[PDB]
Nucleic acid binder design. Structure first.
Length: 223
DNA sequence: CTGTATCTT
DNA sequence: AAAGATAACAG
């Protein structure tokens, strides 16, 4: 029992011994000694703890973790109780309300409900220095997350990838566009949401693509 | 009014 | 690479 869920560890451990990862983890450790880094150590890999890797069906991809005190916890866009939904999440909920008829604001920002249904809540970069958005980009996280996306692309079928923001969209290259579905839009952050997110209907679209593939749809209200 | 991306140089 | 411009709205 530990940081990486068993199935994920079993399919990603090969990255552990690679120089870029040994260097990456070294960087994060040094940063944590001089600054506050989010999320906490034991929460950087929460996204491997919600469901078996062979059960992922949808992948919502973000940029990097929330950089405010105790928001980030391993699942992209999610915040544990009693932390109130951050602006980006309130925008996700707003999109969900007009996109999904029955969806109503859950009264909290914890997205474990989606994750448990097979929605991988990943960010392109997995750690961030307090108060500095995307401060840990280009340190090795992207290559690690490329490995994640790559395993899914190669070992799964009919997955729905949701790329939110320019950085997440960089993963676009790694996905067989005819073997999987890739939907891309602006980051739900207030600073960019008006660039396409509001009105993207990614949630209903995901379910329609899912149904056509013969998979049960995600119950976005199940939170 | 301040804090929450994206494009350009 | 890093910073300026630009932008849109809830707390």
């Amino acid at each position: 029992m530990e940081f990486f869920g068993e199935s994920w560890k079993k399919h990603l451990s090969g990255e552990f011994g690679k120089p870029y990862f040994i260097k990456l983890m070294g960087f994060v450790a040094e940063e944590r000694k001089h600054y506050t880094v989010y999320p906490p150590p034991h929460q950087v890999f929460t996204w491997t703890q919600m469901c078996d890797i062979k059960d992922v069906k949808v992948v919502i991809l973000g940029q990097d973790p929330y950089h405010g005190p105790n928001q980030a916890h391993g699942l992209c866009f999610s915040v544990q109780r009693p932390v109130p939904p951050p602006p980006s999440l309130e925008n996700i909920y707003k999109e969900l309300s007009t996109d999904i008829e029955d969806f109503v604001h859950p009264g909290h920002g914890d997205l474990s409900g989606w994750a448990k249904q097979g929605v991988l809540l990943l960010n392109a970069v997995l750690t961030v220095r307090a108060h500095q958005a995307n401060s840990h980009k280009e340190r090795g996280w992207e290559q690690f997350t490329d490995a994640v996306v790559s395993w899914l692309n190669q070992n799964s079928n009919g997955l729905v990838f949701l790329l939110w923001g320019s950085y997440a969209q960089k993963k676009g290259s790694a996905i067989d566009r005819k073997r999987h579905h890739v939907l891309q839009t602006a980051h739900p952050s207030p600073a960019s949401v008006y660039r396409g997110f509001f009105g993207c209907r990614h949630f209903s679209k995901t379910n329609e693509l899912l149904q056509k593939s013969g998979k049960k749809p995600i119950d976005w209200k199940e939170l």
